[PDB]
Amino acid sequence: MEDLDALWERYREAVRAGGNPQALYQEMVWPALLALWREKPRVYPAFAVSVHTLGTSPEATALAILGAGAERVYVLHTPESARFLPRLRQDTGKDLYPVEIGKSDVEAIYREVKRLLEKHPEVPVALDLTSGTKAMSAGLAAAGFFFQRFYPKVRVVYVDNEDYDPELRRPRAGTEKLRILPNPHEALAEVDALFAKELYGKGEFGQAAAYFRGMVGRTGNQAYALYALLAEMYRAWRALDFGEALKAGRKLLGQLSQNVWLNHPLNARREALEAQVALLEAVDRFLKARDFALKEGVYGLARTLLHLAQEAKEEAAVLAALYAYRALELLLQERLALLGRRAEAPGLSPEEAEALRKALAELLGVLPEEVRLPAKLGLLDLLAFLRLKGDEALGRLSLAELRGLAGALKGRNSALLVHGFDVPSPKAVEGIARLAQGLLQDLEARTALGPLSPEPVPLGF
Amino acid sequence: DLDALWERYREAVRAGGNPQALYQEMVWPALLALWREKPRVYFPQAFAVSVHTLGTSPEATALAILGAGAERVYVLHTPESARFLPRLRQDTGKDLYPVEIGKSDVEAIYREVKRLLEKHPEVPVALDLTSGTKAMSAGLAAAGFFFQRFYPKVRVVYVDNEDYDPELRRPRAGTEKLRILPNPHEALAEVDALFAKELYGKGEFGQAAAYFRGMVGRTGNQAYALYALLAEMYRAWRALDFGEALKAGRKLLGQLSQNVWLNHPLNARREALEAQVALLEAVDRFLKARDFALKEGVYGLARTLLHLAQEAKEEAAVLAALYAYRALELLLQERLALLGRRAEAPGLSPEEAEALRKALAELLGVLPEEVRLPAKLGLLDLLAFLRLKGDEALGRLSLAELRGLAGALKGRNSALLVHGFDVPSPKAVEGIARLAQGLLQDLEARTALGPLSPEPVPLGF
């Protein structure tokens, strides 16, 4: 090695004397450097296959072949650099499997890497980008980091070096070292936040929380524990577990009020978070009481259900119907509470029951004698009853709209996930959600929560 | 023009002149002029920001800056390439924003690119990798393609050429052109299958179908259309849209029967597919008839609901309870039918009603007068009635087991998403689902389907 450092200087001074650079490199330097790499590869801390781009200088590639020490060696060369395959054979002693590519045909690099990984799918593979055009090297690296998703044993490698002489177009002999170029997730920790943020923006709150919690496990940065709490709060809220959501939100607000978290980015949104936690509190209170005097909790629950129905409208129509039916039922029951009455025991007088059978018969296209009122008012019975009692919000419904909704309202309990086998049309679910929305805006005006959305607050990064 | 200039340059070099100084004197002014007049840029592109690595080759970075035409220009240089910043300012005429990095510090590339995208989050940004070490260029490309996931307007760019003279270490003048380097996702069609197969493996059937549809177009290969149908069938099945699931499964089976597709990989799992489609057909039949003599459809619907309940139990227990209650209800009604009683309105004599009130009281630990029998039997009422009528499966349950189930069973209709406000424990869902599973295993033996799983068949690639 100090032999190598001494003859490097001998070479340098011979070049300053007028000796040719390439010739004296081949004669004085390269045999000793090559012998060193044969005996002892300068390799950072397993490869079964190595794949090497090949440009106009074969020496870097010879070193990378010896450093990876793979049994199977592929060489991605161009029509122009094919001339160097004999030298590669004689310097490495390896069988070469050559693949010709254009020097900036990045797609072909991608395709050849695909083909090779499919040929060697479960062994460690080194992708050496040292030699070639920037297009070849960058294409090989890009292909490697892309395919690690599906071929995790792939590694991108590089003959790093120290004293690159721009005149000599070579580094100082003996400073070369083969090493692994890390992928961005491996290299830069904060990029995990990006994955978490993406999942959060998709409504995948449980996975987002898992990512944030794993980041605290990786780096110890407790700022991401607060983000995990937030994602956990939304996970629980979207799953209708208002107790767990309230607990997570209260923990989060408590943490954000500590001096150490004063500049956490979620504090830029504190009021929004406080309002959402107030909503969760109100819903928790209403769920415990089951009493429709608690207007804020009725609003919070119906708002949550209508938002869930809107999100399920495309991918989950059966659930969308269920959410929309429950929201409308809650809102109609709150209207009945405006009259002091309860749907499970409305206390209909004989005159009221007769009038209700007549109105239901007109809506259902039957005779009043065919209408049988259950002990607990069904959804359509409740709507008809409120109209009979002069409810101002339901009185505004046209007869055409109500006739259009009558089939869907009548079949509330006949839904597949309640007691029957039916799925109403998406158009009817749309009409049920529209009716519910109008009742919700009436209630929203009468509640201390004001208008509030379940949409998540922006993360602030 | 530039052709004749390049021949004059090569001639002056042949005559012993200094290649680099002669490039600076004879070639570089004409090329720089040309890139100021009309830069050679492959379809013309508009960038707001450009980011440039800088090695020992400032000419390439000047061409890249002028080609990108960005208002804001960042230069990622090393301590060794810093001395080139003044000349790069003169050639381009731009205010440069320099950022220092080590020549192999790939983490530093990732960090600085991340900072710059955060500073310019919504504008098109060019990452020029032409000049620098291979670690710098490959790091910039890898950073670009990685961050495209989160910053879609990022592009990786490169000053390519038609010919490069390896002795002069220069592109042939006037053959340089600024090119976008494609990311491996957009350059390789076939990779979409791997993504689909990943999504399919995680049960994301809609996205898997979407990727399969994409592949059909980008390749010539209608084979992927079959995969798309399979994914659509599972999507519809999980969403409880049995009609659409059956439509897709029948279309798929009919295509797998054509001569062209006899070697399709799905035909390796043909038997399983056929069985799943028959289950779907039986469920579709049962949903139209709503009659518990159709044992196969009862089995298929209860099996589907129990699978969904098991999937939802841990993180969506409200929904899991809804699914598990429906599954258990169906199975108990089928067992009422099997006893020869009407499964939707068993006609209890006053003597049977009295006996059932006594049995429920002894069970619930209350007095008989505190038990009220609704017009529709609840789950607990129905289970106790089946036990009174000598049902053997249910007769095997112990008193301890029944009292452990009694709370959950009484809460069928008081579930939040039915008529009430209950938010259940995953433990209560587990009890309901385990009772249902036992009844399902009993019905399995009495059905022409036999045992079948809603678990997706392997793709076979």
UniProtKB/Swiss-Prot annotation, chain B:
Non-specific ssRNase activity is allosterically activated about 1000-fold by cyclic tetraadenylate (cA4), which probably binds to its CARF domain. GO terms for biological process: defense response to virus. Pfam families: Cas_Cas02710 (PF09670), Csm6_6H (PF22205). Residues 1-187 are annotated as: CARF domain. Gene3D superfamilies: Hypothetical protein VC1899 like domain (Restriction endonuclease-like) (3.40.50.10770). Changing R412A: No ssRNase activity. InterPro entries: Csm6_6H. The keyword Hydrolase applies. The keyword Nuclease applies. Signal peptide: none annotated. It is an enzyme of class 3 (hydrolase). One of its GO terms (molecular function) is endonuclease activity. Its EC number is 3.1.-.-. Belongs to the CRISPR-associated Csm6 family. CRISPR (clustered regularly interspaced short palindromic repeat) is an adaptive immune system that provides protection against mobile genetic elements (viruses, transposable elements and conjugative plasmids). CRISPR clusters contain spacers, sequences complementary to antecedent mobile elements, and target invading nucleic acids. CRISPR clusters are transcribed and processed into CRISPR RNA (crRNA). A single-strand-specific endoribonuclease (ssRNase) producing free 5'-OH. Activity is approximately 1000-fold stimulated by cyclic oligoadenylate (cOA); only cyclic tetraadenylate (cA4) stimulates the ssRNase activity while linear oligoadenylates do not activate the RNase. Another study showed stimulation by linear tetraadenylate at very high concentrations, but did not examine stimulation by cA4. This is CRISPR system endoribonuclease Csm6.
